[PDB]
Design an enzyme around this catalytic site. Structure first.
Site, PDB file in Angstrom:
ATOM      1  N   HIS A  44       0.773  -1.252   0.000  1.00  0.00           N
ATOM      2  CA  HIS A  44       0.000   0.000   0.000  1.00  0.00           C
ATOM      3  C   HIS A  44       0.800   1.295   0.000  1.00  0.00           C
ATOM      4  O   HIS A  44       1.974   1.315   0.351  1.00  0.00           O
ATOM      5  CB  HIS A  44      -0.894   0.049   1.246  1.00  0.00           C
ATOM      6  CG  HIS A  44      -1.560  -1.245   1.555  1.00  0.00           C
ATOM      7  ND1 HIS A  44      -1.357  -1.910   2.741  1.00  0.00           N
ATOM      8  CD2 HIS A  44      -2.413  -2.005   0.831  1.00  0.00           C
ATOM      9  CE1 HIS A  44      -2.060  -3.028   2.737  1.00  0.00           C
ATOM     10  NE2 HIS A  44      -2.709  -3.107   1.590  1.00  0.00           N
ATOM     11  N   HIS A  46       1.135   4.654   1.856  1.00  0.00           N
ATOM     12  CA  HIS A  46       0.720   5.234   3.112  1.00  0.00           C
ATOM     13  C   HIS A  46       0.769   6.744   2.954  1.00  0.00           C
ATOM     14  O   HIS A  46       1.481   7.264   2.097  1.00  0.00           O
ATOM     15  CB  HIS A  46       1.584   4.703   4.259  1.00  0.00           C
ATOM     16  CG  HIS A  46       1.254   3.285   4.634  1.00  0.00           C
ATOM     17  ND1 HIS A  46       0.841   2.919   5.896  1.00  0.00           N
ATOM     18  CD2 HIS A  46       1.209   2.156   3.883  1.00  0.00           C
ATOM     19  CE1 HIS A  46       0.548   1.627   5.908  1.00  0.00           C
ATOM     20  NE2 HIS A  46       0.762   1.146   4.700  1.00  0.00           N
TER      21      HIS A  46
HETATM   22 CU   LIG Z   1      -0.128  -0.805   4.234  1.00  0.00          CU
END
Ligand SMILES: [Cu+2]
Ligand SMILES: [Cu+2]
Ligand SMILES: [Zn+2]
Ligand SMILES: [Zn+2]
Lengths: 151, 151
Positions: A44, A46
């Protein structure tokens, strides 16, 4: 910027280089991560490109539209929700993602933010506990890096 | 972002945390760098936020206006020219700069780019030679980090 790069580093053996390229109307993400345990790992963007306290200071998933966590193919997901990367038994994950929410310029820009690869799989917000709706139960952050402008 | 942060790391003993804050048409730079040899050390913003080859892949000093190297007070300077930071006997340099040219937003934002702390002092384009109006003879790059968005 039409190109960006991210070098992932952590306290352990996990490392990798991620490349981003604005092509047409989307962003193509490529590269590889090594040192991973075989199987899926959350991947991901952030919110903050702050490494003052290791990967911890990067904060939560980039979420300018204030949505709950989900998989990259879901309507309800964070802009930073790129799902899972998959490591083979040699511990190598080849990254090949094209994503409709991230960008390298403007409101959705991930330039200056942090890319993180997690210890466990991202349940894509379907785990059934509150944590699933925030991080997909992906757990700790094995390696991360600030996304920078590339040549 | 009205705030940014950069964590400097190198192969050697130099490390540091640099903070950036937008104020008016200036950017207030603060923080500290430790592990330095006593004396001055050039402090510049380099073009790319690419750490794939250590601090070398950061490219030249951020110079979107195509000018020669200089000191921060000079009209003829690269946007990335933030002069020198002074280290004391203990090898700790406390950073405090207010600059009118670097920005945390717009065409010429430094977010996503690289902060570099040098080996030798910066002659501010006044050493005479040719490496003086390009890099100010600041020498090798001891530590660097990509400038990221901060909370
Ligand atoms: Cu993450
Ligand atoms: Cu320099
Ligand atoms: Zn998420
Ligand atoms: Zn310069």
């Amino acid at each position: 910027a039409t190109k960006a790069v991210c070098v992932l580093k952590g306290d352990g053996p996990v490392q990798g280089t991620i490349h981003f390229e604005a092509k047409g109307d989307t962003v193509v993400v490529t590269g590889s991560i090594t040192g991973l345990t075989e199987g899926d790992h959350g991947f991901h963007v952030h919110q903050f490109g702050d490494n003052t306290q290791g990967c911890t200071s990067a904060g939560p998933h980039f979420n300018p539209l204030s949505k709950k966590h989900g998989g990259p193919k879901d309507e309800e997901r964070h802009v930073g929700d790129l799902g899972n990367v998959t490591a083979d038994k040699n511990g190598v994950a080849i990254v090949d993602i094209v994503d409709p929410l991230i960008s390298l310029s403007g409101e959705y820009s991930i330039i200056g933010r942090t890319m993180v690869v997690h210890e466990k799989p991202d349940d894509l917000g379907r785990g059934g506990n509150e944590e699933s709706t925030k991080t997909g139960n992906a757990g700790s952050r094995l390696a991360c890096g600030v996304i920078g402008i590339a040549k």
